[PDB]
Amino acid sequence: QKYLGMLQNGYSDSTSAYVDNISTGLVVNNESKLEAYKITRVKTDDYDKNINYFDLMYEGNNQFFIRANFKVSREFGATLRKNAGPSGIVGSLSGPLIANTNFKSNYLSNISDSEYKNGVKIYAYRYTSSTSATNQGGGIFTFESYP
Numbered sequence: 001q002k003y004l005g006m007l008q009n010g011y012s013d014s015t016s017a018y019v020d021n022i023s024t025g026l027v028v029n030n031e032s033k034l035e036a037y038k039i040t041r042v043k044t045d046d047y048d049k050n051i052n053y054f055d056l057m058y059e060g061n062n063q064f065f066i067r068a069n070f071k072v073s074r075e076f077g078a079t080l081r082k083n084a085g086p087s088g089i090v091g092s093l094s095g096p097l098i099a100n101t102n103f104k105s106n107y108l109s110n111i112s113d114s115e116y117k118n119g120v121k122i123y124a125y126r127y128t129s130s131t132s133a134t135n136q137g138g139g140i141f142t143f144e145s146y147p
Contacts, residue, residue, distance in 0.1 A: 035145040043122040043139030065105030
């Protein structure tokens with residue numbers, strides 16, 4: 001147990017595939033691999049993800065931002081382009097809203113499998129109000145789906 005975190009041999013499927021040495025598996029619909037999968041991402045003033053909900057993942061029809069933890073941000077957020085670059089709301093964080101599995105963070109298809117396998121997409125703005133943008137970290141992302 002002191003090597004790998006937790007592999008889902010009939011355990012909970014809350015993603016949790018996180019800092020490198022946590023062997024964790026998941027299988028969902030819309031890309032061709034059963035995933036013993038890993039995430040090794042670092043962003044600013046951060047250790048692994050911070051503020052709950054920050055990765056790239058794999059449920060929906062496209063390649064998109066994680067549903068990392070069980071609380072859902074209905075927040076209509078502005079996920080803009082690559083590291084520390086503001087270019088406008090390409091990602092309009094909104095529905096769908098469901099949870100309990102690896103799910104979609106408002107279909108950020110624009111951030112794709114190339115930015116998933118050794119990605120850069122923990123960067124994100126948070127909005128308290130309808131236009132109050134705050135930057136709390138952003139940097140390297142990493143993922144690897146495997147047998």
